[PDB]
Amino acid sequence: NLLTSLVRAHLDSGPSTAKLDYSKFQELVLPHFGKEDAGDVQQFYDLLSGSLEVIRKWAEKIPGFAELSPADQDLLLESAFLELFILRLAYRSKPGEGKLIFCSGLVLHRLQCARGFGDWIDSILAFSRSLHSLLVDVPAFACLSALVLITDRHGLQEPRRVEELQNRIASCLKEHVAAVAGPASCLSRLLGKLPELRTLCTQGLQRIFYLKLEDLVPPPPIIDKIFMDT
């Protein structure tokens, strides 16, 4: 069934805890006075960039996504990148111990991250504290993130198909949270996340803006383009 392909895709993409690079991790209690140096913005951009290749590779693995047009595969992917990023990050990190795990498998401390993420990172952890208290299980999360991707976008070549695939995933989610219990919310508790997630992209754009002005290192073209869909 589909829910399985969704689960495999989620699972077969994120860094399995036990391939997570700790070689740059620093346990800090030391908030850092300093204007972010060029090393930080370079780190910042490499994580975004990294996260995008993972996200992309995970999309093909979503049944039906790949038989959509290349342009819509790019439209959906490009419009969804930043939220997917936040959401995948939030679910896999452990806030109770201020640890951010990135899709590339890099572990990194909250205060390590304030450097190039700014106060953004706090709202991401707050939101991540939000997610965990909801105890969203894996299958549901694998539907939830698919829905953030497969969703209506202005200038879609073929909105009707996307809606069909959106529908399959959505009812597929409903089946599952049905099984857990006795359509009825619950769902909309979980689904209430999706707009909270939209605020978070905002601050990320703000942060990318502030960095496109301080203008140390150039952004990766891939990410500048996404930023430019503004």
Please give the Cα distance from 214 to 201 (Å, whole number): 20
| Phi, psi values for residue 223, rounded to 5° | -90, -35
**150 token code pair:** 């497969």
Q: Which residues in 147-159 are b (16+ Cβ under 10 Å) and which e?
A: bbbbbeeeebeee
How do 107-109 and 99-101 pair as beta strands? antiparallel
Find the length of the chain: 230
The set of residues, in sequence order, having a beta carbon less than 8 Å from that of 139 and lying 6+ positions away, is 3, 6, 7, 176
Question: Minimal CA–CA distance to 115: which of 100, 105, 130?
Answer: 100
**124 token code pair:** 């991401």
| Phi, psi values for residue 200, rounded to 5° | -65, -40
Q: What is the resolution of this structure in A?
A: 2.8
Please give the Cα distance from 32 to 36 (Å, whole number): 9
- What would the DSSP string read from start to end of the chain? -HHHHHHHHHHTTS--SSS---TT---------S---HHHHHHHHHHHHHHHHHHHHHHHTSTTSTTS-HHHHHHHHHHHHHHHHHHHHHHHSBGGGTEEEPTTS-EEEHHHHHHHHTTHHHHHHHHHHHHHHHT--HHHHHHHHHHHHSS--TT-S-HHHHHHHHHHHHHHHHHHHHHS----TTHHHHHTHHHHHHHHHHHHHHHHHHHHHH--SPPPHHHHHHHH--
Q: Is 115 within 8 Å of 40 (Cβ atoms)?
A: yes
Please give the Cα distance from 124 to 137 (Å, whole number): 19
Crossing angle for the helix pair 193-214 and 70-92, nearest 10 degrees?
A: 100
Question: Minimal CA–CA distance to 65: which of 139, 138, 8, 146?
Answer: 146
Q: Which residues in 27-66 are b (16+ Cβ under 10 Å) and which e?
A: eeeeeeeeebeeebbebbbebbebbbebbbebbebbbebe
Please report where in the chains the tokens 């979503």 appear, as a residue.
62
Question: Minimal CA–CA distance to 194: which of 57, 86, 48?
Answer: 86
Question: Minimal CA–CA distance to 193: which of 132, 150, 152, 138?
Answer: 132
**229 token code pair:** 């869909």
Q: Is 146 within 8 Å of 169 (Cβ atoms)?
A: yes
Give me the CATH topology for the region 1-230: Retinoid X Receptor (1.10.565)
Domain ranges of the chain: 1-230
Q: Is 125 within 8 Å of 95 (Cβ atoms)?
A: yes
